[PDB]
Amino acid sequence: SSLSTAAARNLATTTKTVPQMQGITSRWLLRLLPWVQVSGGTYRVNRRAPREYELSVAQTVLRTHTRVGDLYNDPMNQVEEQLKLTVQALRERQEHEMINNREFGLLHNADLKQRIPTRSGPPTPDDLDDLLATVWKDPGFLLAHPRAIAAMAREWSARGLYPTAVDFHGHSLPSWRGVPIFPCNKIPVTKERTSSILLLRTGEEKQGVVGLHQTGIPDEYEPSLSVRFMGIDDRAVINYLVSAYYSAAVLVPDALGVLEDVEVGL
């Protein structure tokens, strides 16, 4: 019964699948942020000396054995799958740097007048209204941690408020006064169980937060991402350099607002 079935499997093929990554998340900042093309890796912003923006690089070395690249290509190209997973990891760390970097990160490039605290510590609807009023000109969307979103929803339930869920493209999302709320785990949660909420206006024509990249680069794989052969070493390992160029820019101080010290709760 079982032995016969196993023996039969010995002459059959199993259905496998691409390696599955638990880490892969919904990189909402990359999808929502408009991307403006820069030349020479430099972008000038005339602010009321102009600020200079240099493209940062997220790069890594992909090492693949020569045997893997030669033999294991029958059902699917293993070097291509390794490249896809490498690009996915690159995009994840890009999303992390768009928020947490000390040079162009959103959490650190916010004007001191635009950062506001919470009156009591939980993210009450009053704090949401204050955050909305900070960026009062065409507010694009809110970005928060899942714990933060849970905390705001518990304040809504405690106050007897059921906010309408906006339908953004094919996705239904929570919203506050028409402003869609997007979850992002890259936003830090401190050991005191506190986080931050970001309200953004997006667009170059609206003087909002934009993303900076450079498409067209040579040896390009995906837009603004390039893969280059580096060589084979004495142990017969093929090395590839994969590089993605990216930056962020807030055109005017009022395009970004931060609600700070949000008590998400344990």
Numbering used by the authors: 18 to 65, 252 to 469
What does the study report here?
Encapsulins are a prevalent protein‐based compartmentalization strategy in prokaryotes.
Negative stain transmission electron microscopy (TEM) analysis of purified Sl‐Enc1 and Sl‐Enc2 highlighted that Sl‐Enc1 did not assemble into regular encapsulin nanocompartments. Rather, a broad smear is observed, suggesting that Sl‐Enc1 does not assemble into homogeneous protein shells, forming irregular aggregates instead. As Sl‐Enc1 cannot form shells on its own, the obtained symmetry‐averaged Sl‐Enc1 map has to be treated as artifactual. However, we were able to use this map to build an atomic model of the Sl‐Enc1 protomer. First, Sl‐Enc1 exhibits a clearly defined 23‐residue N‐arm, not present in the Sl‐Enc2 protomer. The second major difference between the Sl‐Enc1 and Sl‐Enc2 protomers is that their CBDs show different relative orientations with respect to the HK97‐domain with the Sl‐Enc1 CBD being tilted by ca. 23° compared to the Sl‐Enc2 CBD. The discernable N‐arm states result in substantial differences in the size and charge of the two‐fold pores.
